Amino acid sequence: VPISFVFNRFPRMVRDLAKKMNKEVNFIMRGEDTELDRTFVEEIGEPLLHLLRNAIDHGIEPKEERIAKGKPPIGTLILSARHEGNNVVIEVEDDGRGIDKEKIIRKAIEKGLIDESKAATLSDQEILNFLFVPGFSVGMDVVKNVVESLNGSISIESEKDKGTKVTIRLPLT
Ligand SMILES: Nc1ncc2ccc(-c3cnn[nH]3)cc2n1
């Protein structure tokens, strides 16, 4: 079916959470007519909701902070779907504060997941993928678990003060 069956739930959720946290969010949905198999439609809402909540809570900064940082005052959250060959690609993008990669590394060292000696040459993907480790810092492990139950993949791109883009890829069947 069309992914609108999932996406149409989100403006109310986004608006309620933004209100609760006294933030202003410009929420844009694209590609809502993208069709995919019912099994995906039935399961993908929960992970997407988690990612949207992360963007509103942890990503987009309060207006006053954005102004102080010389950013546009209202944060933008874009949820998109598209076909790419045999895959459907779903992206959740915010222009908030980004994920703090140094914080991740420090936590990974604390937890014994990496030796300090290996931190300097870690790739960006290797750093951000620590967020999918169970217990790391209801977590992102559960997002990845659902995506993988759908034979999908997930990746994160993020830069300090720029924002965060989470990409889910799903197969045709
Ligand atoms: N969209 C967005 N923006 C900033 C974030 C900051 C931290 C986290 C996170 C930490 N531990 N698990 N997730 C997720 C974020 N997601």
Side-chain angles (χ1 to χ4, degrees), residues 2-136 138-173:
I3 202 169
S4 58
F5 186 72
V6 175
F7 286 12
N8 286 333
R9 301 309 103 219
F10 296 146
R12 177 157 198 173
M13 303 195 90
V14 169
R15 293 194 266 224
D16 288 349
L17 182 60
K19 185 172 90 74
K20 269 190 194 58
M21 292 182 179
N22 200 34
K23 274 161 195 192
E24 274 187 283
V25 182
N26 174 34
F27 183 45
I28 298 169
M29 301 199 297
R30 291 184 183 145
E32 64 275 12
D33 54 347
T34 303
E35 299 216 13
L36 67 174
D37 185 79
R38 176 196 299 273
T39 301
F40 300 121
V41 170
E42 285 170 343
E43 300 291 350
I44 198 64
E46 159 200 340
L48 294 177
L49 193 66
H50 191 317
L51 295 174
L52 296 171
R53 172 183 196 74
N54 286 348
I56 297 162
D57 185 5
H58 306 307
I60 290 167
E61 317 98 316
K63 188 200 330 188
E64 63 83 15
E65 189 176 354
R66 296 182 56 93
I67 291 172
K69 287 170 146 190
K71 296 177 79 172
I74 299 175
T76 295
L77 176 58
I78 311 184
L79 170 64
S80 63
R82 61 196 188 283
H83 298 280
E84 196 199 301
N86 62 292
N87 286 3
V88 164
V89 182
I90 303 163
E91 294 170 353
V92 178
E93 186 160 10
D94 70 77
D95 69 342
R97 70 179 74 253
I99 293 164
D100 179 350
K101 291 169 181 165
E102 260 311 310
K103 177 170 161 140
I104 292 175
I105 293 170
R106 291 169 182 167
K107 203 164 319 264
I109 296 171
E110 189 76 77
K111 291 171 143 293
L113 305 181
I114 61 170
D115 197 275
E116 169 275 333
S117 59
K118 292 176 190 306
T121 63
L122 284 169
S123 73
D124 292 319
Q125 285 304 113
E126 293 175 307
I127 297 163
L128 292 168
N129 278 336
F130 281 117
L131 298 179
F132 295 120
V133 171
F136 186 84
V138 206
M140 288 279 275
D141 62 317
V142 180
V143 176
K144 183 156 188 176
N145 290 341
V146 172
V147 170
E148 289 200 319
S149 77
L150 301 173
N151 302 327
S153 64
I154 185 167
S155 67
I156 307 175
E157 298 168 286
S158 189
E159 297 291 317
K160 160 187 192 294
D161 293 326
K162 304 191 187 175
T164 302
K165 181 176 184 176
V166 184
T167 304
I168 291 168
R169 290 177 171 277
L170 302 175
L172 180 65
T173 69

PDB file of all heavy atoms in Angstrom, residues 73-91:
ATOM      1  N   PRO A  73      15.354  30.305  12.754  1.00  0.00           N
ATOM      2  CA  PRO A  73      14.791  30.096  14.095  1.00  0.00           C
ATOM      3  C   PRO A  73      13.991  28.817  14.316  1.00  0.00           C
ATOM      4  O   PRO A  73      14.061  28.238  15.383  1.00  0.00           O
ATOM      5  CB  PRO A  73      13.927  31.352  14.316  1.00  0.00           C
ATOM      6  CG  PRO A  73      14.321  32.315  13.255  1.00  0.00           C
ATOM      7  CD  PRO A  73      14.885  31.545  12.109  1.00  0.00           C
ATOM      8  N   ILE A  74      13.216  28.399  13.329  1.00  0.00           N
ATOM      9  CA  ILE A  74      12.386  27.201  13.419  1.00  0.00           C
ATOM     10  C   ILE A  74      13.165  26.031  12.827  1.00  0.00           C
ATOM     11  O   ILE A  74      13.635  26.137  11.731  1.00  0.00           O
ATOM     12  CB  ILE A  74      11.037  27.429  12.699  1.00  0.00           C
ATOM     13  CG1 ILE A  74      10.241  28.568  13.337  1.00  0.00           C
ATOM     14  CG2 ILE A  74      10.228  26.154  12.623  1.00  0.00           C
ATOM     15  CD1 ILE A  74       8.977  28.941  12.634  1.00  0.00           C
ATOM     16  N   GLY A  75      13.296  24.919  13.530  1.00  0.00           N
ATOM     17  CA  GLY A  75      13.969  23.742  13.020  1.00  0.00           C
ATOM     18  C   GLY A  75      13.082  23.000  12.028  1.00  0.00           C
ATOM     19  O   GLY A  75      11.864  23.043  12.135  1.00  0.00           O
ATOM     20  N   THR A  76      13.709  22.318  11.092  1.00  0.00           N
ATOM     21  CA  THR A  76      13.004  21.582  10.047  1.00  0.00           C
ATOM     22  C   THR A  76      13.290  20.089  10.178  1.00  0.00           C
ATOM     23  O   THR A  76      14.431  19.680  10.383  1.00  0.00           O
ATOM     24  CB  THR A  76      13.401  22.099   8.657  1.00  0.00           C
ATOM     25  OG1 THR A  76      12.947  23.460   8.550  1.00  0.00           O
ATOM     26  CG2 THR A  76      12.732  21.337   7.549  1.00  0.00           C
ATOM     27  N   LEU A  77      12.205  19.312  10.048  1.00  0.00           N
ATOM     28  CA  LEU A  77      12.238  17.864  10.109  1.00  0.00           C
ATOM     29  C   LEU A  77      11.594  17.345   8.850  1.00  0.00           C
ATOM     30  O   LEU A  77      10.441  17.688   8.592  1.00  0.00           O
ATOM     31  CB  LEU A  77      11.482  17.425  11.361  1.00  0.00           C
ATOM     32  CG  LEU A  77      11.310  15.931  11.559  1.00  0.00           C
ATOM     33  CD1 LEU A  77      12.633  15.202  11.612  1.00  0.00           C
ATOM     34  CD2 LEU A  77      10.515  15.665  12.829  1.00  0.00           C
ATOM     35  N   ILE A  78      12.334  16.574   8.049  1.00  0.00           N
ATOM     36  CA  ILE A  78      11.842  16.081   6.760  1.00  0.00           C
ATOM     37  C   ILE A  78      11.829  14.566   6.782  1.00  0.00           C
ATOM     38  O   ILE A  78      12.854  13.947   7.025  1.00  0.00           O
ATOM     39  CB  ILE A  78      12.702  16.580   5.591  1.00  0.00           C
ATOM     40  CG1 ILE A  78      12.919  18.096   5.680  1.00  0.00           C
ATOM     41  CG2 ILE A  78      12.070  16.231   4.244  1.00  0.00           C
ATOM     42  CD1 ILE A  78      13.675  18.723   4.534  1.00  0.00           C
ATOM     43  N   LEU A  79      10.663  14.001   6.513  1.00  0.00           N
ATOM     44  CA  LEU A  79      10.476  12.579   6.388  1.00  0.00           C
ATOM     45  C   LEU A  79      10.185  12.288   4.923  1.00  0.00           C
ATOM     46  O   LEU A  79       9.242  12.854   4.373  1.00  0.00           O
ATOM     47  CB  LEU A  79       9.302  12.160   7.253  1.00  0.00           C
ATOM     48  CG  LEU A  79       8.796  10.734   7.077  1.00  0.00           C
ATOM     49  CD1 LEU A  79       9.845   9.712   7.480  1.00  0.00           C
ATOM     50  CD2 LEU A  79       7.535  10.511   7.876  1.00  0.00           C
ATOM     51  N   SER A  80      10.933  11.391   4.297  1.00  0.00           N
ATOM     52  CA  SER A  80      10.795  11.161   2.862  1.00  0.00           C
ATOM     53  C   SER A  80      10.851   9.679   2.552  1.00  0.00           C
ATOM     54  O   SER A  80      11.542   8.907   3.241  1.00  0.00           O
ATOM     55  CB  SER A  80      11.831  11.889   2.100  1.00  0.00           C
ATOM     56  OG  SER A  80      13.082  11.448   2.417  1.00  0.00           O
ATOM     57  N   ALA A  81      10.135   9.290   1.502  1.00  0.00           N
ATOM     58  CA  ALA A  81      10.237   7.954   0.930  1.00  0.00           C
ATOM     59  C   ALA A  81      10.425   8.071  -0.567  1.00  0.00           C
ATOM     60  O   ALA A  81       9.869   8.960  -1.181  1.00  0.00           O
ATOM     61  CB  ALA A  81       8.999   7.132   1.246  1.00  0.00           C
ATOM     62  N   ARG A  82      11.145   7.116  -1.134  1.00  0.00           N
ATOM     63  CA  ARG A  82      11.330   7.071  -2.565  1.00  0.00           C
ATOM     64  C   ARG A  82      11.720   5.646  -2.939  1.00  0.00           C
ATOM     65  O   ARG A  82      12.247   4.865  -2.138  1.00  0.00           O
ATOM     66  CB  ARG A  82      12.399   8.058  -3.045  1.00  0.00           C
ATOM     67  CG  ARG A  82      13.777   7.804  -2.476  1.00  0.00           C
ATOM     68  CD  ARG A  82      14.624   9.050  -2.712  1.00  0.00           C
ATOM     69  NE  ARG A  82      16.031   8.926  -2.397  1.00  0.00           N
ATOM     70  CZ  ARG A  82      16.570   8.948  -1.197  1.00  0.00           C
ATOM     71  NH1 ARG A  82      15.910   8.546  -0.130  1.00  0.00           N
ATOM     72  NH2 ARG A  82      17.847   9.269  -1.080  1.00  0.00           N
ATOM     73  N   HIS A  83      11.569   5.345  -4.225  1.00  0.00           N
ATOM     74  CA  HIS A  83      12.098   4.130  -4.812  1.00  0.00           C
ATOM     75  C   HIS A  83      13.533   4.393  -5.266  1.00  0.00           C
ATOM     76  O   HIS A  83      13.800   5.429  -5.896  1.00  0.00           O
ATOM     77  CB  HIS A  83      11.253   3.700  -6.028  1.00  0.00           C
ATOM     78  CG  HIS A  83       9.829   3.372  -5.744  1.00  0.00           C
ATOM     79  ND1 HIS A  83       9.458   2.147  -5.227  1.00  0.00           N
ATOM     80  CD2 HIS A  83       8.685   4.099  -5.861  1.00  0.00           C
ATOM     81  CE1 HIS A  83       8.152   2.143  -5.030  1.00  0.00           C
ATOM     82  NE2 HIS A  83       7.653   3.308  -5.416  1.00  0.00           N
ATOM     83  N   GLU A  84      14.435   3.437  -5.019  1.00  0.00           N
ATOM     84  CA  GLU A  84      15.763   3.451  -5.607  1.00  0.00           C
ATOM     85  C   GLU A  84      15.999   2.012  -6.069  1.00  0.00           C
ATOM     86  O   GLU A  84      16.250   1.118  -5.264  1.00  0.00           O
ATOM     87  CB  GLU A  84      16.807   3.951  -4.611  1.00  0.00           C
ATOM     88  CG  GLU A  84      18.132   4.348  -5.247  1.00  0.00           C
ATOM     89  CD  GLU A  84      19.288   4.404  -4.261  1.00  0.00           C
ATOM     90  OE1 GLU A  84      19.210   5.168  -3.287  1.00  0.00           O
ATOM     91  OE2 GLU A  84      20.263   3.676  -4.479  1.00  0.00           O
ATOM     92  N   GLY A  85      15.848   1.807  -7.383  1.00  0.00           N
ATOM     93  CA  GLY A  85      15.886   0.480  -7.957  1.00  0.00           C
ATOM     94  C   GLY A  85      14.869  -0.439  -7.302  1.00  0.00           C
ATOM     95  O   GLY A  85      13.668  -0.149  -7.295  1.00  0.00           O
ATOM     96  N   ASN A  86      15.392  -1.507  -6.693  1.00  0.00           N
ATOM     97  CA  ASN A  86      14.572  -2.535  -6.088  1.00  0.00           C
ATOM     98  C   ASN A  86      14.319  -2.215  -4.621  1.00  0.00           C
ATOM     99  O   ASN A  86      13.536  -2.949  -4.012  1.00  0.00           O
ATOM    100  CB  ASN A  86      15.200  -3.932  -6.236  1.00  0.00           C
ATOM    101  CG  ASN A  86      16.546  -4.065  -5.544  1.00  0.00           C
ATOM    102  OD1 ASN A  86      17.523  -3.455  -5.964  1.00  0.00           O
ATOM    103  ND2 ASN A  86      16.616  -4.846  -4.479  1.00  0.00           N
ATOM    104  N   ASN A  87      14.976  -1.150  -4.095  1.00  0.00           N
ATOM    105  CA  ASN A  87      14.852  -0.805  -2.680  1.00  0.00           C
ATOM    106  C   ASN A  87      13.833   0.355  -2.526  1.00  0.00           C
ATOM    107  O   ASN A  87      13.670   1.202  -3.407  1.00  0.00           O
ATOM    108  CB  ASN A  87      16.169  -0.376  -1.990  1.00  0.00           C
ATOM    109  CG  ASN A  87      17.211  -1.425  -1.662  1.00  0.00           C
ATOM    110  OD1 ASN A  87      17.037  -2.576  -1.997  1.00  0.00           O
ATOM    111  ND2 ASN A  87      18.269  -1.029  -0.954  1.00  0.00           N
ATOM    112  N   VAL A  88      13.170   0.437  -1.375  1.00  0.00           N
ATOM    113  CA  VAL A  88      12.525   1.680  -0.939  1.00  0.00           C
ATOM    114  C   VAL A  88      13.434   2.311   0.108  1.00  0.00           C
ATOM    115  O   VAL A  88      13.958   1.647   0.987  1.00  0.00           O
ATOM    116  CB  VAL A  88      11.088   1.481  -0.402  1.00  0.00           C
ATOM    117  CG1 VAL A  88      10.579   2.669   0.401  1.00  0.00           C
ATOM    118  CG2 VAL A  88      10.129   1.174  -1.545  1.00  0.00           C
ATOM    119  N   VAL A  89      13.635   3.613  -0.025  1.00  0.00           N
ATOM    120  CA  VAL A  89      14.536   4.369   0.839  1.00  0.00           C
ATOM    121  C   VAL A  89      13.686   5.356   1.616  1.00  0.00           C
ATOM    122  O   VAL A  89      12.970   6.135   1.030  1.00  0.00           O
ATOM    123  CB  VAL A  89      15.636   5.083   0.026  1.00  0.00           C
ATOM    124  CG1 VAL A  89      16.601   5.819   0.925  1.00  0.00           C
ATOM    125  CG2 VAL A  89      16.405   4.072  -0.822  1.00  0.00           C
ATOM    126  N   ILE A  90      13.791   5.302   2.933  1.00  0.00           N
ATOM    127  CA  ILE A  90      13.095   6.218   3.804  1.00  0.00           C
ATOM    128  C   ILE A  90      14.113   7.025   4.570  1.00  0.00           C
ATOM    129  O   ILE A  90      15.006   6.430   5.149  1.00  0.00           O
ATOM    130  CB  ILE A  90      12.162   5.458   4.765  1.00  0.00           C
ATOM    131  CG1 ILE A  90      11.150   4.572   4.034  1.00  0.00           C
ATOM    132  CG2 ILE A  90      11.470   6.442   5.670  1.00  0.00           C
ATOM    133  CD1 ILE A  90      10.508   3.548   4.888  1.00  0.00           C
ATOM    134  N   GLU A  91      13.996   8.352   4.611  1.00  0.00           N
ATOM    135  CA  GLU A  91      14.971   9.182   5.288  1.00  0.00           C
ATOM    136  C   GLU A  91      14.246  10.074   6.296  1.00  0.00           C
ATOM    137  O   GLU A  91      13.143  10.570   6.071  1.00  0.00           O
ATOM    138  CB  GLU A  91      15.701  10.083   4.276  1.00  0.00           C
ATOM    139  CG  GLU A  91      16.585   9.355   3.280  1.00  0.00           C
ATOM    140  CD  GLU A  91      17.107  10.255   2.152  1.00  0.00           C
ATOM    141  OE1 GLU A  91      16.685  11.462   2.046  1.00  0.00           O
ATOM    142  OE2 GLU A  91      17.925   9.831   1.357  1.00  0.00           O
TER     143      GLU A  91
END
